[PDB]
Design an enzyme around this catalytic site. Structure first.
Site, PDB file in Angstrom:
ATOM      1  N   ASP A   1      -5.111   4.815  15.975  1.00  0.00           N
ATOM      2  CA  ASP A   1      -4.316   4.046  15.189  1.00  0.00           C
ATOM      3  C   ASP A   1      -5.007   2.427  14.268  1.00  0.00           C
ATOM      4  O   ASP A   1      -5.900   2.235  15.727  1.00  0.00           O
ATOM      5  CB  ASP A   1      -2.578   3.438  15.117  1.00  0.00           C
ATOM      6  CG  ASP A   1      -3.584   1.763  16.152  1.00  0.00           C
ATOM      7  OD1 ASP A   1      -3.306   1.982  17.499  1.00  0.00           O
ATOM      8  OD2 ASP A   1      -3.072   0.742  15.837  1.00  0.00           O
TER       9      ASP A   1
ATOM     10  N   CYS B   1     -11.706  13.299  -2.847  1.00  0.00           N
ATOM     11  CA  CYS B   1     -10.414  12.720  -2.946  1.00  0.00           C
ATOM     12  C   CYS B   1      -9.690  12.803  -4.294  1.00  0.00           C
ATOM     13  O   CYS B   1      -9.059  13.564  -5.377  1.00  0.00           O
ATOM     14  CB  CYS B   1      -9.512  10.966  -2.690  1.00  0.00           C
ATOM     15  SG  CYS B   1      -8.246  10.628  -2.090  1.00  0.00           S
TER      16      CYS B   1
ATOM     17  N   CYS C   1      -6.627   8.581  -7.215  1.00  0.00           N
ATOM     18  CA  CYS C   1      -8.473   9.291  -7.511  1.00  0.00           C
ATOM     19  C   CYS C   1      -7.643  10.052  -8.709  1.00  0.00           C
ATOM     20  O   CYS C   1      -8.205  10.508  -9.632  1.00  0.00           O
ATOM     21  CB  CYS C   1      -8.984   9.593  -6.725  1.00  0.00           C
ATOM     22  SG  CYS C   1      -9.537   8.622  -5.355  1.00  0.00           S
TER      23      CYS C   1
HETATM   24 ZN    ZN Z   1      -8.236   8.663  -3.806  1.00  0.00          ZN
END
Ligand code: ZN
Ligand code: ZN
Lengths: 365, 365
Positions: free
Chosen positions: B262, B300, B305
């Site tokens: 985390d 991505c 994106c």
């Molecule tokens: Zn992205």
């Protein structure tokens, strides 16, 4: 689709319901436009704005011409592409915000200089952003105004309306793909409102805004001015009341012949903790909501009311959490869209007067 | 599903990949947990958190026990219902934040008083929130620490680990439906790390965290301590490195046997303008992005994106717009989830060492 076609499908008294067809989509009227400041409807993705039912958004121009800049947005492909909203956008002319947010302003017949926005430059900026509905550049008279100053400002605005018309028409791609609305001024004076309407109608526009009625007038006064001002406008074109308003302002304005609305109240006051409900606004920060598991509004169809409680959103807003702003804003814009739908359906069914009365009695109980 | 079952499907050196099955869902390992502070993953709806690929989130307890309060959240139906996340939640014990954010703290063998959180009260709070993975309450030794102070703190933490174990087991519904992890302490000292591991394993936990390595150690030192510390832990249980870290920290930690992570970096630095890319982090506020139409990262798969440019998000962040925080945060958590998926798949395919080297050469180019 055509560049611009406004069709009225049904009427009830002065109220109308219909559609505006444009190249980028159809706008159901009466319409509420969420306001996009700095190329974003604050705290919402455009898909979320559409999910609430919005057919068109307003883009403020003032901030955009300052950052990122109009020429920059044009180079990047235009405002629709830039922000990811592919449906119609109405752009304001920049004039109001140039007066209220700028420094050392200098007004002249040519335009305003501030820390030179003229009618021509405003129409050009709206073009560079790729606006679908372009607003004429005008002067938004303060309230109150003496009749002499109201007349002077209105007369200037009508000269700038003609300048705006000619600037728009001289750019082929803009004239072929966008629409141009003119703005009625005249403060609260019937004779000036008439002169203004007459001037605008002689120039000719695709739609007619009622300008200058959201700058301090109370509802009673605003409605009184709408009573005589809206009938002066061409019947067969859309009537746009700029900057209005509260749910009850909207209902009454539609009763007086208005077709289109914008205002920052659902977004701005959502971020501040005010939620609209059919029983009136509530301020979610109040301690009475800390353990309330009901949704913001008991009938609302929105995603926020489907999934989260008052108690959770109370917590978020008090905590300053971004998600609080997001949920309040989605709900409030959804509420406004549901109000517009109820208005459209009731006019279409011939029962809008009864809706307006039922709405009022419960919203103010 | 069982209350708790960790299964290792594949291995490569010290790295493992597998699954943790729990009543509220399956967690793919190695796992990254987005951090929820004050019952929200900042700027994201839980559905968005899930869309990025997260299987589990971390809920900080400290803020929640202060507002809205644990008993309040229990009365409202628990943290899952309250915030709208129905999958596993790991809750921290509150101890670290009580030390770093509170005033006039007063430490004792019983617990800490601040402006009384004890092991028993911490485990109770985690129960009231409805945590799926409960963390033992411990003392997070500062860095650096002398060996004497490290030993003292570790010894106290091991006493509090037994207290935590007994508190958890004495509540039937918690013992039957949640899991309990113990935390290894000992600063950077091998003998103390061993003593700690031995103490925890004699008590017995469902998983073992490596505590105290995200409080100022550089990567070289952190990795050196992981080299000897992770093998001390039971092999057949999950290994959780608390508070780590950067993409490259995560890759190296998995190379050393860590299963769970985390940290606030993707959320917090997203809001500040840092975007993770396979070519390294970028600071989107830099002027070089003002007209860059590429997505944040060229490969991505995330929604941000798919739809928005660097140029637009540059504008949003510089403008202070909420949507900037939202998009940066979604992207960054999606990037972290895609990293975890690449790690899982490469271990499963026996090519993780090659992935780690390829990742490093490009991330640091
Ligand atoms: Zn992205
Ligand atoms: Zn709602």
């Amino acid at each position: 689709r055509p560049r611009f076609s406004f069709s009225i499908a049904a009427r009830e008294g002065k109220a109308r319901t219909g559609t505006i067809e444009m190249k980028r989509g159809v706008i159901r009227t009466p319409a509420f436009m969420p306001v996009g400041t700095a190329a974003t409807v604050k705290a919402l993705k455009p898909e979320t704005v559409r999910a609430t039912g919005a057919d068109i958004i307003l883009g403020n121009t003032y901030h955009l011409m300052l950052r990122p800049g109009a020429e920059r947005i044009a180079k990047l492909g235009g405002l629709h592409s830039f922000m990811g909203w592919d449906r119609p956008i109405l752009t304001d002319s920049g004039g109001y915000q140039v007066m209220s947010l700028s420094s050392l302003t200098k007004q002249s017949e040519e335009g305003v200089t501030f820390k030179m926005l003229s009618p021509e430059r405003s129409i050009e900026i709206q073009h560079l952003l790729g606006s679908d509905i372009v607003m004429a550049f005008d002067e938004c008279t303060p309230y109150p105004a003496t009749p002499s100053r109201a007349a002077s400002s209105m007369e200037r605005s009508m000269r700038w309306a003609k300048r705006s018309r000619d600037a728009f028409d001289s750019r082929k791609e803009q004239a072929e793909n966008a629409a141009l609305f003119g703005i009625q001024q005249g403060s609260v004076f019937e004779n000036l409102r008439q002169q203004s309407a007459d001037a605008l109608a002689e120039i000719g526009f695709d739609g007619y805004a009622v300008g200058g009625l959201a700058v301090g007038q109370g509802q009673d006064e605003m409605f009184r001015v709408l009573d005589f001002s809206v009938p002066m406008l061409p019947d067969d074109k859309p009537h746009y009341l700029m900057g209005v308003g509260k749910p009850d302002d909207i209902v009454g304005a539609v009763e007086r012949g208005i077709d289109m609305f914008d205002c920052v109240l659902p977004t701005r006051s959502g971020r501040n903790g005010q939620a609209f409900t059919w029983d009136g606004p509530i301020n979610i920060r109040n301690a009475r909501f800390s353990e309330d598991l009901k949704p913001l509004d008991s009938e609302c169809h929105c995603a926020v009311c489907q999934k989260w409680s008052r108690a959770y959103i109370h917590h978020l807003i008090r905590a300053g959490e971004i998600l609080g702003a997001m949920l309040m804003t989605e709900h409030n814009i959804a509420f406004y869209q549901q109000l517009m739908q109820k208005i459209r359906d009731s006019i279409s069914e011939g029962r809008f007067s009864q809706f307006a009365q039922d709405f009022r009695a419960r919203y103010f109980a």
